Design a protein around this ligand. Structure first.
Ligand SMILES: CC(C)(COP(=O)(O)OP(=O)(O)OC[C@H]1O[C@@H](n2cnc3c(N)ncnc32)[C@H](O)[C@@H]1OP(=O)(O)O)[C@@H](O)C(=O)NCCC(=O)NCCS
Ligand SMILES: Nc1ncnc2c1ncn2[C@@H]1O[C@H](COP(=O)(O)O)[C@@H](O)[C@H]1O
Length: 528
């Protein structure tokens, strides 16, 4: 194999430490500093407050019957309670699965069943989505705001005595976070991220004499991207905690709250995606705010492009801009912008970083299986302790995704250049990404085939300025059917979260397939 590595040296990583022990390892240095700032109500929790509340919640969860290797579901927007629940479960050697609170009842229940969640932590407004399921299956519902009848209030956890945490034996390979991802084909699967994996990933980002991302205890990091995706849970929360930074929580993006919070709290680190920068570009009010405190703008999920790069340079005059690359199964971070290093490296516009330290990357020709040299595009593969343990209860999908030599096959096409900078150029896998949210076409295709008037279906991404990609469907009608485009859309829209909505339907005689019987998705993308 032709193997690529970081321009940074390998470092010592204390991957034997439980995630909480690692994240709070240097807490004595940060004890009285702001840890979580709730942007809406201006409440500040210090590092001491957050460690203590997490321990209280651990005792509370223990009292509610959570044992090692049990799972809780967090169904919350960004909030201090999200953090206390996640870290609380970690202290017990238990698992947090995280879900978008805007999921439909069917979506929430599917994930609750797949994950065997024992408790669902949510808001009162979402109780109706899970109440019947939870009652029938002895799943406790705990609300952070007010508790409807049959539910508990989150104070039942925070009122617990921190000294009532049981003795716990946590192993490095124990699962601690369970985000869902459809990976390189098929339906959403549970991604088992471990103590060892997440400690490794966080260390790869922020540890070392020359860290790949230089952040420190004086930084103020905006947490507007959702904590229910590992993207922010890892790179914002866990990384921020490790270095003693303040994490400024937003429950929901709007341009005014965003600008006000950056100015008022003097945000120094801005973890964004391109739709946030597009909102900035399209809002003249931006020129009336001071965003000079921002020293680092990190973008990922999708290419920013030259115009949005220009917006960042114009509106964040003191910010270093860089793009990075992650995938849930990879821990998630594969490549990181070396312009962010304490001793920075030069970068090129359009790059998505350099492969993380303490890891190996190779580029594999899909036609041959052979590894490729510099400047030649192929399937990006990564190997290292930071990647997932595997898919929960899915050995087949695991074996198809991570090979016997430990290589994760991402389904992404890219190349590494002469300066060890990675560029993403194409996607081999069927995945659709709407503003950074996963849309699994296999899920939509299955929902479409449920309709009596639909014979065959194929869901593919269509390029979109506002969302990056939107789902579109090529649909074959049943015999003697006059189903309309709007009828197909409305049928789907009632069942799915907003981002999975089908935006165009194209009626065709047949779906292009290989002799084996698989959708020729590249051909359909070419048509669009
Ligand atoms: C990019 C960004 C912050 C956009 O935030 P946003 O302005 O809230 O826009 P979104 O499209 O995400 O969400 C808004 C939609 O939520 C839906 N929604 C909001 N409240 C709702 C409710 N109470 N009930 C049902 N739907 C609701 C609406 O459809 C709404 O659309 P509208 O505002 O046009 O009516 C956001 O998309 C984001 O966080 N993206 C990255 C996600 C991520 O981290 N992914 C994994 C790692 S890349
Ligand atoms: N910087 C990026 N540029 C282009 N695509 C990206 C980038 N970062 C992530 N992706 C895509 O998003 C996938 C990860 O999705 P998720 O697991 O939901 O974070 C990757 O496998 C890529 O297909």
């Amino acid at each position: 194999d032709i193997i690529f590595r970081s321009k940074l040296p390998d470092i010592y990583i204390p991957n034997h430490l439980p995630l909480h022990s690692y994240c709070f390892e240097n807490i004595s240095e940060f004890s009285s500093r702001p840890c979580l700032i709730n942007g809406a109500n201006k409440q500040i929790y210090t590092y001491a407050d957050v460690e203590l509340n997490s321990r209280k919640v651990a005792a509370g969860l223990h009292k509610q019957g959570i044992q090692p290797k049990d799972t809780i579901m967090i169904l919350l927007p960004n909030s201090p309670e999200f953090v206390f629940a996640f870290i609380g479960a970690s202290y017990l050697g238990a698992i947090s699965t995280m879900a978008n609170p805007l999921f439909t009842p069917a979506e929430v229940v599917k994930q609750a069943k797949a994950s065997s969640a024992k408790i669902i932590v949510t808001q009162a407004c979402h109780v109706n989505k899970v109440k019947d399921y939870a009652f029938e299956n002895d799943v406790k519902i705990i609300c952070i705001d007010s508790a409807p009848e049959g539910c508990l209030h989150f104070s039942v956890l925070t009122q617990a005595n921190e000294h009532d945490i049981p003795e716990v034996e946590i192993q490095p390979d124990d699962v601690v976070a369970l985000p869902y991802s459809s990976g390189t084909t098929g339906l959403p699967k549970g991604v088992m991220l471990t103590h060892k994996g997440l400690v490794t990933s966080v260390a790869q980002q922020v540890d070392g004499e020359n860290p790949n991302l230089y952040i420190h205890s004086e930084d103020v990091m905006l947490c507007v991207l959702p904590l229910f995706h590992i993207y922010s849970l890892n790179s914002v929360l866990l990384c921020g905690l490790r270095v003693g930074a303040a994490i400024l929580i937003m429950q929901k993006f709007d341009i005014v709250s965003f600008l006000e919070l950056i100015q008022r709290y003097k945000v120094t680190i801005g973890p964004f995606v391109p739709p946030i920068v597009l909102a900035i570009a399209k809002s003249p009010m931006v020129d009336d705010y001071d965003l000079s405190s921002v020293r680092t703008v990190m973008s990922g999920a999708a290419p920013l492009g030259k115009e949005l790069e220009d917006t960042v340079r114009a509106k964040f005059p003191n910010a270093k801009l860089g793009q990075g690359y992650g995938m849930t199964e990879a821990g998630p971070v594969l490549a990181m912008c070396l312009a962010f290093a304490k001793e920075p490296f030069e970068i090129k516009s359009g790059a998505c970083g350099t492969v993380v330290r303490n890891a190996e990357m190779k580029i594999v020709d899909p036609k041959t299986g052979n590894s490729l040299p510099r400047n030649q595009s192929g399937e990006i593969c990564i190997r290292g302790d930071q990647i997932m343990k595997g898919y929960l209860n899915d050995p087949e999908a695991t074996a198809r995704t991570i090979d016997k030599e430990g290589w994760l096959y991402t389904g992404d096409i890219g190349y590494i250049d002469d300066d060890d900078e990675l560029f993403i150029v194409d996607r081999l896998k069927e995945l659709i990404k709407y503003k950074g949210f996963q849309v699994a076409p296999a899920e939509l295709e299955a929902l479409l085939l449920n309709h009596p008037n639909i014979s065959d279906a194929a869901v593919v991404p269509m390029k979109d300025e506002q969302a990056g990609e939107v789902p579109v469907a090529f649909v074959v009608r049943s015999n003697g059917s006059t189903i309309t485009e709007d009828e197909v859309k409305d049928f789907i829209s009632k069942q799915v979260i907003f981002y999975k909505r089908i935006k165009r339907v194209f009626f065709v005689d047949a779906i292009p397939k290989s002799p084996s019987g698989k959708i020729l998705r590249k051909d359909l993308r070419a048509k669009l």
